[PDB]
Amino acid sequence: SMQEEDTFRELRIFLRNVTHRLAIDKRFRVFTKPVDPDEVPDYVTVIKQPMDLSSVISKIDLHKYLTVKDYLRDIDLICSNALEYNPDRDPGDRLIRHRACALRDTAYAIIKEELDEDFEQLCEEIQESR
């Protein structure tokens, strides 16, 4: 309905604002663009489902997220992809894993603090009816 497209538009506005706040954080610069095969050739090997914050913005604009859970699944994908590509003890890996955990925890904490629980529930129930 008009009432439901309003809800989904508000969700999109919210998710764009969260994602922008993640994307401008210096810690998360490695997660802002897709991995370049030129700069990192063996990534396309290990990571079957690449994800990054620019792709999140495009999916928002494509109406691909109808719920916050849907969005958080892709945030979790950015994080788990980074843990898988960086399993070793050496400091390059440990630094990426730390930022990846911080990206995930930051996204969850912004949503917990600023997203109304009844709004996310409305989003869920509209989606379940489709």
Ligand X SMILES: CC(=O)c1nc(NC(=O)[C@H]2CNCCN2)sc1-c1cc(O)cc(O)c1
Q: Which stretches of the chain bind ligand X, using CB under 6 A? A: 30, 33, 35, 40, 82, 85-86, 88, 90, 92-93, 96
Q: Using N-to-C axis directions, what is the helix angle for 68-85 and 53-61, rounded to 10°?
A: 160
Least CB distance to ligand X at residue 9 (A):
31
Cβ neighbours of residue 57 closer than 8 Å, sequence gap 6 or more:
16, 19, 23
Shortest distance in whole angstroms from residue 23 CB to ligand X:
13
- Rounded CA-CA distance 9/26 in Å is 28
Give the residue with the Cβ less far from ligand X, 30 or 115. 30
Closest approach of ligand X to the CB of residue 86, in Å? 5
Cβ closest to ligand X, residue 86 vs residue 106: 86
Q: Which is nearer to ligand X, 58 or 129 (CB)?
A: 58
Q: Which is nearer to ligand X, 40 or 109 (CB)?
A: 40
Residues with Cβ < 8 Å from 86, sequence gap 6 or more? 92, 93, 94, 96, 97, 100
The residue of the chain with the least Cβ separation from ligand X equals 92
Which amino acid is it at 13? Answer: I
Residue 69 CB, shortest distance to ligand X, in Å, is 23
Instruction: Find out whether 89 and 75 touch, Cβ atoms under 8 Å.
Output: no
